[PDB]
Amino acid sequence: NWSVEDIVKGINSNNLESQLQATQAARKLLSREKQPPIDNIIRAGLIPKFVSFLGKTDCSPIQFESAWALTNIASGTSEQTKAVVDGGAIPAFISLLASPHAHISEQAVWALGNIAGDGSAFRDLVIKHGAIDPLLALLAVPDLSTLACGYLRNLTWTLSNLCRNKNPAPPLDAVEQILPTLVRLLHHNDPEVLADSCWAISYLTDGPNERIEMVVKKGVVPQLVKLLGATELPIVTPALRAIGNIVTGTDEQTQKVIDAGALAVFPSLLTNPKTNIQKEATWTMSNITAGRQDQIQQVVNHGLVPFLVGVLSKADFKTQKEAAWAITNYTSGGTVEQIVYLVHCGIIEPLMNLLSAKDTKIIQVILDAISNIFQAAEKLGETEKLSIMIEECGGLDKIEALQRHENESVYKASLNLIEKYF
């Protein structure tokens, strides 16, 4: 437990062993859980010294201790990561990826993951310095099972950080170069590797449908569905996020998700005790019911309409908002028979109950769904039965009250409903 002044004195001697002992003391200081003095180390001007120690190939202990200290600094705030980058760390760490000592190259992998995970500019700067080739060369083995578990986990985490941010998305060539290794990791039997691979895939599918397509042409959708059915929440959460992202794309990409059997997992996801799982599953469902009529029919055939009724009836309010979206998308794109089936499953009462929520968008969504169901009833000539059913559930007075809402869209929708069917 040295002081920062003693560390500085040790570093500023011209003595390689004294420097090594000071750097180790700095590593131990920066490794404590109780408020490590990162800012004091930075203000003392130590980062350039650590970076120059990264290149002392004759003294691998000081390479290791410097890499560890710098990794700890790069794990802090954006200002601290920037101080590491501004000391010249990025190319020095990329050079260290070639070290024959696994603990040293692992430390460089970790450091580059922290720098890249700071944000899209540093991720792109790490890519521009050429990290991807040596990172992938570390995984160029026929069977991933021959690598050390912790080493493989660190590489997967760092690779997922190179995929992470969105404004801008990572360069296409970088994604293309990383994707085969990412798919390998997505098939590797280690829960942490699986979780981090899934997160990477979820990042790469969040965006325009072209990015989704380049993910789905690798054939990962069946493995995502398999992981969707896992028992570990850290795996299910990113797998579900990735599936949800894919079903925001074209109808063919959504169909790839359906053909893999995703819908059979959804009864448990839509009843999962973890509210975030229920919310994301309902969001995914809402994007599937925004699809073609045969895809709505697949939702119906899997028995999922009663689960949508249930989550609309009782759930966290955000999950209920997602369920309202699912119902409006269903009623907008569904056949008359599908809409009749939805009403037969009991959607009217939970819709009316939610009409009392304070959120303006959910009210607009519910009114749009009611209008769509009324249009289906018109096509069937049963508008009066629908009006009676809505009144019996206490929705008539709610719409009557809403026709004097502060919002113009609510105004017009409720007024049109009252004037046309009531």
Partner: peptide, 23 residues
Amino acid sequence: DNKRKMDETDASSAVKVKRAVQK
């Protein structure tokens, strides 16, 4: 187009932004 991508619901999100060693 009734499909809603991410950032149309909630926020960007994610996990494991940075990791310290602490070994």
